[PDB]
Design a protein around this ligand. Structure first.
Ligand SMILES: Nc1ncnc2c1ncn2[C@@H]1O[C@H](COP(=O)(O)OP(=O)(O)CP(=O)(O)O)[C@@H](O)[C@H]1O
Ligand SMILES: Nc1ncnc2c1ncn2[C@@H]1O[C@H](COP(=O)(O)OP(=O)(O)CP(=O)(O)O)[C@@H](O)[C@H]1O
Lengths: 307, 307
């Protein structure tokens, strides 16, 4: 039976690096790595370097597409130093590593030959502010599609992709667990924009950011491993993030192991798991590349859309 | 505010014909034209000839895309006489003319320079048989997404697009209003496949045929004009299709004008209108080209996705 997809193991995937140079130190890697992530330079070589090659092939080809349409329209012909921005989505559960995957990809792409402006935007910035989530009764549904300003998000990406000189995104504080009054992240005609968040691959009765992606990544694992990663990170954060007395979640710092395991499982149960099953996981079939992790965080399997 | 879309009037659209030759006679047109359609050679020149140009530009460019991915994969390099089939979806309400739009497009494309094999498949073939729709209680929901074998449909298109030597579709009788035992439409590595039906542009929790389209058309009009077209065609068919004594709908042939208007409005009300509002119309935002008709069937407006 034919298939839109081709499966790979790590063996088969890493043979597709060919000549791609590794342009990243073990220290540089460390500063991109998230708490509890296991990615090392081997993973970068065997997994991210083929990915970066695939993308660089598709960038140039994807630009022929937009050029056909401008030829058709009888249009100027595009300043070769403002091409149509290549837009990359990165999706997956809370805790699955997707933020690391995206920072790593940005660093690999920024170090490609001619130094492309490669911007990274997470959807956190487009969450409704808490006072607005309260109004909507959504303070316990952060991460659910409806907790985001999806219209503002779509505007932002439509602005960038349509060639705008600048586009602004709001900024979320993880310390305060709320949007920061007055803060802007300003994206300036980048060559590549990576957009990272839980539900970025969603589709619906309107045109959405997924409809603008030229390439998409989904970072996957079994649900039970993700929960284990999530709980263990919650426990770890008792002495990193929760320890700051300003942290919205400071009360958690003084939880016993067992108490924190109880809190963490409840949050997973009531918020993150439902979101993953109801909203995120149904977007996986469309991702261009699914990156499949084993219980140790290791990417050992891959699924590429060839159609 | 920037926009994925550009709007056109007929003036602006038809200037984009450039050199495209008209390769179709007034008689050839007639045999493609559906009952109550008003399309003539002018419409073909000013509307379909630019469309055919747009497509021919995108075909060659879309093939660079699939070629990038085979380069990446270290793959043979594609027999230039079996390229990856370009897949075109055509959608819209019952009665809106979409079947004519598709037959016309096929004829225009087949007459392009090097004589591309251009196949046309409607989703009718993939309706569940009546005995199966009865089983599911769906005999009065023909046209609703669930009245189709969507898995078989997706298989068919995945087969063709992935380069298969042949792929078979079942065949629906409009005379008998049921699938024909033993009938097959056989599609053989065409260069272009047009797929036409009500809901072909749908998205969902699985990969669907819309995810395989390289280009999509939606044929649009105000809902009240479509109803008027539908009712008037139902009345007309009293002496064409319904007149055949074998026709499943023969009892309608003997309806008075007023009685047929009553029957037709009820079918619109209970089946076609709900389907259009709930299922078809929410797919319009994704179509590459929306063809907007006035109350006389005339295409006077267009909306192209540039993103
Ligand atoms: N259990 C929890 N409760 C509150 N805040 C949490 C949390 N777990 C993580 N956070 C915070 O929110 C963000 C979590 O990102 P998330 O887990 O959704 O994606 P991810 O898995 O890609 C992060 P990374 O790849 O860097 O490990 C981090 O910035 C962290 O500070
Ligand atoms: N009111 C009705 N009741 C039963 N059968 C009908 C019908 N109206 C049309 N049909 C039949 O079913 C098909 C209708 O196609 P539909 O209206 O869904 O698309 P369309 O508007 O693109 C057709 P065309 O473009 O040729 O006018 C035709 O083959 C016709 O024989």
């Amino acid at each position: 039976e034919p298939s839109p997809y081709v499966e790979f193991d790590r063996r088969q995937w890493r043979a597709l690096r060919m000549s791609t140079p590794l342009a990243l130190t073990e220290e540089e890697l460390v500063g991109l790595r998230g708490l509890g992530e296991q990615i090392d330079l081997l993973e970068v070589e065997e997994v991210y370097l083929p990915l970066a090659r695939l993308i660089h092939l598709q960038v140039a080809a994807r630009q022929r597409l937009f050029a056909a349409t401008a030829e058709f329209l009888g249009e100027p012909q595009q300043n070769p130093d403002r091409p149509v921005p290549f837009i990359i989505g990165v999706a997956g559960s809370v805790a699955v590593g997707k933020s690391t995957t995206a920072r790593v990809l940005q660093a690999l792409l920024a170090r490609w030959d001619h130094h492309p402006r490669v911007d990274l935007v997470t959807t956190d910035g487009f969450l409704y502010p808490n006072a607005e989530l309260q109004r909507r009764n959504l303070m316990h549904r952060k991460g659910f599609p409806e907790s985001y300003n999806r219209r503002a998000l779509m505007r932002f990406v439509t602005s960038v992709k349509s060639g705008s000189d600048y586009a602004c995104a709001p900024v979320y504080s993880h310390l305060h667990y709320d949007i920061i009054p007055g803060a802007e992240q300003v994206v300036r005609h980048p060559d590549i924009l990576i957009l990272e968040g839980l539900n970025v691959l969603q589709t619906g009765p309107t045109l959405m950011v997924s409809d603008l992606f030229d390439f998409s990544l989904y970072v996957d694992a079994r649900i039970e491993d993700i929960e284990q990663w999530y709980v263990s990170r919650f426990l770890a954060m008792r002495t990193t993030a929760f320890a700051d007395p300003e942290s919205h979640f400071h009360h958690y710092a003084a939880f016993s192991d067992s108490q924190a395991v109880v809190a963490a499982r409840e949050i997973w149960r009531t918020i993150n798991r439902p979101n993953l099953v109801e909203n995120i996981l149904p977007t996986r079939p469309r991702a261009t590349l699914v990156l499949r992790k084993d219980a140790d965080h290791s990417i050992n399997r891959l699924r590429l859309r060839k159609l």
